[PDB]
Every structure is written in structure tokens, then in C-alpha cells.
């Protein structure tokens, strides 16, 4: 029973590898040789945000690009006005340990998750004007690692028990459960069309998940180590995943294999966060050695280095219009870098 | 642009109120000390939290000693895979590691030693100081007195081992029991001392998990940790 299933699984894996090898007629690097390189990108810190006590693990951007949400491990969730460096909202957290925060595309709600396994959704449009817990999501056996908003009604969350779940916020019950992981799902990134999302886990594989169907269409196995962060290319056809093996890898959904590996010999430290610009030409990678690298997605060279953080860069976020980049690190500072 | 000025004034007033609340919270946060409790499933971590107080992912215990606020976090409904979320606890003041010593049969002590080694050797946990509690001394004493011993079979070095002179034995305790307890303590010390170059230090205590003074020990250890940090700050140590 076990022997036949394992042999059949190995044969299927070999068939998938052979198909991927057949598809790889020419690499991305070979095609992009005759492309004008971007050059050095001298981003500067236009704004610095102050008022975080503990380390800032995650941040999310608004669709309007005016407001951002930063999660900290002090028990405080802060909504920041990026232009004027003003704190729009300060929210006390029931659990001190919060690893993820999300901002709704409408802007009405803000949900944060942590080690308590409970995702808390806060309504910002309360008539009294004070922040309150709109709803609390229990029912995760693992730690909640990431959450993203499809809309006001439905939220997608990442958990530490190798599961991703879709929750209907009005009911408070999971709409669907994604249970195809063997490793802790560090993060998930929604596509712009919101039909599909990709999740990165500790099993060194990224999964493409269909929100309505509930099964994983594709499995990407090209990483040596744990996948800390996953991000989508702006069209939604490709995604880039950071990892602890100091390699960012770009995977294409239609190719169903890794198009490119972004690595440097001096860089051995792990990659906490990966984000994309509005064009997708530049891939922004956060690191453990206190700096963020701007990578040319076509040429696979380091376009720029952002060195303004005392402690390791936990999260990297890019606005939807692409105007500025907000970087959160463990030194309790949010630095905004503009090209 | 009168409306824009009014909106900016309202934002500044809101920011000022939020900053005042953050300053009060900052004072409370800086005054408070965060402790992470990590222990094995067979180990009596729940017994220690029950004494400390006198489906959720994490358990928080709030206690104050000598007008010093301590928040202790105990891992509850979590997966056995611990590497990603252990990084979150580097910012705390101390990690209280509890190990159960036994002398289905598995080498739990070696697993505990490996876990302590991993915590000590973790990149971001290099700053954190580990307070070590050796649980279940009564069980060790009963097992050694009975004459059947697992630690001797598991450890070849234990057989050719001498009790350290700096160690203080209780009068009621058997010499063999003291040798086993100090040997386990020395194994943790050898890992902590060899691995770490003075950035952080390991405090070992002998407990049966029914002990009133445990909280006091934690307080003393926490005070010592801050003192060592101050000594590190002014480049003494």
C-alpha cells in the first residue's frame, strides 16, 4: 500500500519534472540579454514613521496609497498617514504577539493575526469614532501568519498548521479550507483579479490556490529552504518568492517552473519579504543583513541597495500606484523610500 | 484651501492624542518584562504556570514581583514546528526553558539538550538569555535510589564523571542523585558556555514544579540578566 503509492508519486513527480524540462526551451536570462539595464536606483527615505515600541513584523498598503497599516509586537496596530507622517489610528491588541496585518481595499476594515491563532477584524467606520473589534476568528490550530482581504465580505488567511483558510466575515465561519501543505505557510499574496492566490510555505514549495474551487492547481518546488514571503507580478501570471537560502525565485504559472533565481555570493542571509512595483520590472527584497535589494527582474542584477535599518527588515510593501515603498524592520522604524 | 487646513489640523490633533496614549503605553511597556516559557509535553510547564498564577494559541500570565510587571507567554495550541515563531520572541527579556529529566521509552533529555542548543545558537536568539529550570527532581531521586537508571545507559560520559566542587549538595540528598542532577546541569552549561561568547548567559535551577520560591528565582534571574546587560553596555563584561 505505502510502497506502491510512494512509487506512483515518484513516477508522477518525474513526469512533471520531464514536462517542465521539455517546456524550458530557453531561459529568461537568455531572452533578456538584449534589454536596456535599469542601472543604479538611488531611493531615499522621504518619510520616517515614529511611535512603534516593539518590532514591526508586517505592514500593508491601502489601495488609495494614502494610508498604511503596521503591525507591531507591542500589542499596538497603527494606521499611518504616509504623506504627513501622522498616525490616523492606534489600536490596542488583545494578543501582544501579532505577525500580520491587512487593510481592506474599500478601507472599512483592518484585520490582524498573531500567535493567539485568532484573526481580529476592526471596523474603522464605527459611528462613535473609536476602534472596536468587529469580529474575532478562532478555529486555527496553527499560528496565523498572513492575511489578505478579497473584499469586505471575504478574507483569506495563512496559518501555521499547514492550512490556508477563506473566511466569510459576515458569518464568522470558514468559507473554504486549503489543506495541501506539509509546511507552515508563511505568507499568501492575492492576485489583482482575485480569482487565484499563491502561498509560500516552509516545505520549500509555493502553491497556486483557486479561491472558489478549494484545491491547489499548481505546485512549485524550486527552493532549497523555507519560503518566507510570496508576491505577485502585476499582471497576475507570475509570482516571486523570497526564501531563507538567500535566493529570490520567480515562478511563472503558465510555465509551471521557476523562470529565474536572484542570488548573490556575498548575500547569505535569508529573505524575509518580496514586493513588486507597478510595472514589475523591479523586485524589492528584504533581508536579514539589514538592507533591501532592488533587483532587475529581467537582467537578474542588484539594481539598488537600501541601507537605513538598524535591525532586520521584516516586511517590504509597495503602493498600488507605485509611488513610494514602505519598509518595516525590527528596529521599530518604518522607512519610506522613493526612487 | 480652508477645508484642507481644517483636515490637517484635525489630523494633527488626532496624532497628538495618539502620541500621548503611546507615551503612557510606552512607559507601561518599558517597565514590563516579557518572559517566554518553553517546555516539553511530559514536562510540567502547566504546573509551573498554575503555581505562577497563584484552544488558544498562546497563554499569557500577568504577575508582579516587587512592583515589577512580568508577562509570561506559554506555548499552547501550536504545531511542533517552532522555528518561524521562535524568532518573534527575541525581543523579550528572557526565555524560561523547562526540561524534564527521566532516569514507550525515549531519550527526552537529549531532545531537550538539542532544543536548548538550537535556541542558544539561533541567529536572533543570540541576544536572549535563557533561564533554565530542571523539573522533576523528586522523580530523579526516586529512580536513582531504586537502583535502575536510564541516564547512565544513555550517557557514557556520566559513568566516568565526578561531581564539581563548586556544586552545593543538600544534606538529605543522596550523593548519586546530586551527581546526576549536577551532570545534567553541566551538560546544559557546556552547551551554553561553549556555543556562546559572553553575549547571553544561562541560569540553571533545580525544581520539582511544586515550589513557592520559583517566581522569586525568576525575578532574581531577570534582575541579573538586566544587570549583565548593563555591564555589557558599559563594556565591563
Amino acid at each position, epitope marked *: 500500500e505505502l510502497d506502491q503509492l510512494r512509487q506512483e508519486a515518484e513516477q508522477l513527480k518525474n513526469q512533471i519534472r520531464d514536462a517542465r524540462k521539455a517546456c524550458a526551451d530557453a531561459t529568461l536570462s537568455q531572452i533578456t540579454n538584449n534589454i536596456d539595464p535599469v542601472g543604479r536606483i538611488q531611493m531615499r527615505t522621504r518619510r520616517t514613521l515614529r511611535g512603534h515600541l516593539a518590532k514591526i513584523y508586517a505592514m500593508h498598503w491601502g489601495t488609495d496609497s494614502r494610508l498604511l497599516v503596521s503591525a507591531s509586537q507591542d500589542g499596538k496596530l497603527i494606521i499611518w498617514d504616509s504623506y504627513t507622517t501622522n498616525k490616523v489610528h492606534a489600536i490596542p491588541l488583545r494578543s501582544s504577539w501579532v505577525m500580520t496585518c491587512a487593510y481592506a481595499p474599500s478601507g472599512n476594515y483592518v484585520a490582524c493575526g498573531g500567535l493567539d491563532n485568532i484573526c481580529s477584524i476592526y471596523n474603522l467606520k464605527t459611528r462613535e469614532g473609536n476602534v472596536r473589534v468587529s469580529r474575532e476568528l478562532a478555529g486555527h490550530t496553527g499560528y496565523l501568519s498572513c492575511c489578505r482581504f478579497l473584499d469586505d465580505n471575504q478574507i483569506v488567511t495563512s496559518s501555521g498548521d499547514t492550512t490556508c483558510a477563506l473566511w466569510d466575515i459576515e458569518t464568522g465561519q470558514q468559507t473554504t479550507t486549503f489543506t495541501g501543505h506539509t509546511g507552515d505557510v508563511m505568507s499568501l499574496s492575492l492576485a489583482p483579479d482575485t480569482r487565484l492566490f499563491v502561498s509560500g510555505a516552509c516545505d520549500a514549495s509555493a502553491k497556486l490556490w483557486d479561491v472558489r474551487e478549494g484545491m491547489c492547481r499548481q505546485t512549485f518546488t524550486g527552493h532549497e529552504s523555507d519560503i518566507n514571503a510570496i508576491c505577485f507580478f502585476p499582471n497576475g501570471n507570475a509570482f516571486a518568492t523570497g526564501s531563507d537560502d538567500a535566493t529570490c525565485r520567480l515562478f511563472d504559472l503558465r510555465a509551471d517552473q521557476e523562470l529565474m533565481t536572484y542570488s548573490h555570493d556575498n548575500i547569505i542571509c535569508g529573505i524575509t519579504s518580496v514586493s513588486f512595483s507597478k510595472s514589475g520590472r523591479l523586485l524589492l527584497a528584504g533581508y536579514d543583513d539589514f538592507n533591501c535589494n532592488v533587483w532587475d527582474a529581467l537582467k537578474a542584477d542588484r539594481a539598488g541597495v537600501l541601507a537605513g535599518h538598524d535591525n532586520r527588515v521584516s516586511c517590504l510593501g509597495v503602493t498600488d500606484d507605485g509611488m513610494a515603498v514602505a519598509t518595516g524592520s525590527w528596529d521599530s522604524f518604518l522607512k519610506i523610500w522613493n526612487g | 484651501t480652508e477645508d484642507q487646513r481644517n483636515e490637517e489640523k484635525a489630523q494633527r490633533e488626532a496624532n497628538k492624542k495618539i502620541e500621548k496614549q503611546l507615551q503612557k503605553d510606552k512607559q507601561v511597556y518599558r517597565a514590563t518584562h516579557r518572559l517566554l516559557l518553553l517546555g516539553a509535553g511530559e514536562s510540567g510547564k502547566s504546573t509551573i504556570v498554575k503555581q505562577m498564577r497563584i484552544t488558544s494559541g498562546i497563554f499569557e500570565t500577568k504577575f508582579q514581583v516587587d512592583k515589577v510587571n512580568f508577562h509570561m507567554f506559554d506555548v499552547g495550541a501550536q504545531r511542533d514546528e*517552532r522555528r518561524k515563531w521562535i524568532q518573534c520572541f527575541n525581543d523579550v527579556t528572557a526565555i524560561i526553558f523547562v526540561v524534564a529529566s527521566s532516569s514507550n521509552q*525515549t531519550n527526552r533529555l537529549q531532545e531537550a539538550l538539542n532544543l536548548f542548543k538550537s535556541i542558544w545558537n539561533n541567529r536572533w536568539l543570540r541576544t536572549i538569555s535563557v533561564i533554565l529550570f530542571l523539573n522533576k527532581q523528586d522523580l530523579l531521586a526516586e529512580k536513582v535510589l531504586a537502583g535502575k537508571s536510564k541516564i547512565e545507559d544513555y550517557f557514557p560520559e556520566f559513568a566516568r564523571y565526578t561531581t564539581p566542587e563548586d556544586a552545593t549538595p543538600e544534606p538529605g540528598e543522596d550523593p548519586r542523585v546530586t551527581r546526576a542532577k549536577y551532570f545534567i546541569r553541566d551538560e546544559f552549561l557546556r552547551i551554553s558556555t561553549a556555543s556562546g561568547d559572553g553575549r547571553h548567559y544561562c541560569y540553571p535551577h533545580f525544581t520539582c514544579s511544586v515550589d513557592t520560591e520559583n517566581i522569586r528565582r525568576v525575578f532574581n534571574d531577570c534582575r541579573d540578566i538586566i544587570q549583565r546587560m548593563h555591564l555589557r553596555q558599559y563594556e565591563l563584561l
Partner: nanobody
Amino acid sequence: QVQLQESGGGLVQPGGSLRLSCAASGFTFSNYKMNWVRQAPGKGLEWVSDISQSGASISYTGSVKGRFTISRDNAKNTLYLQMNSLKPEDTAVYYCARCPAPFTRDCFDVTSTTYAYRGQGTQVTVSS
């Protein structure tokens, strides 16, 4: 794709010498410290031995200390375990495991109930 395959095992008499070979695919072998973990029947996983990136620093469980030899060949991309003077307690499934991050000393989740960077393992049984 990270895959570890175990070669060798089966049935061994007590006192016999058994060599366990681990084949590594999908990662750079030199960057990772690697260890052997054994699961006895009806018992939990227990760490047996580890060898570092360079191979100079090697640590063993005391029960297997002086009895098992672990060597890593970077060029042949292979992990070798040498077993001699085996005991009836020694019978267990042997799993080949890799530390999760490169260039690091910590191994948090190598001994854990479901860990994705270990091989399927080969049954080793010792019969007197």
C-alpha cells in the same frame, strides 16, 4: 526540489556493520548542517547525530557516541553513516534530515512529528 533518499538497511545481526547512504538532490550540499534522526516502532523521533557545513564540528547522542560514525562527502553529494556493534535497542527507522536554513547552527524542527525536509527512510531491523 529538496529530496533525500536513504540506501541500505534491511536485517542485520547484532554486532554487524551497516552503512547508511543518503542522497541529496535539489539543494547545495555544503551550505547545510545535516543530521540522522531515528524513529523506533511505537516511539517518538529521536535525534541521533549531526555533522556541520565544514564537517569539523560533529555532535552525537550519547547512546550512539563512539559507536556510529557520520561523514559527509560534498563532492559526491552524499551523507554516510557507519554502524558497528549494533544492539537490539538500536532498531529503528532512520531518517536523513537537513537543517532548515543555510550557514546556521540551530536545528529547531529536525525532530518534529511532520517535517518536510526529511527522507522517507529505510527500515533497519536487528535480529539476534
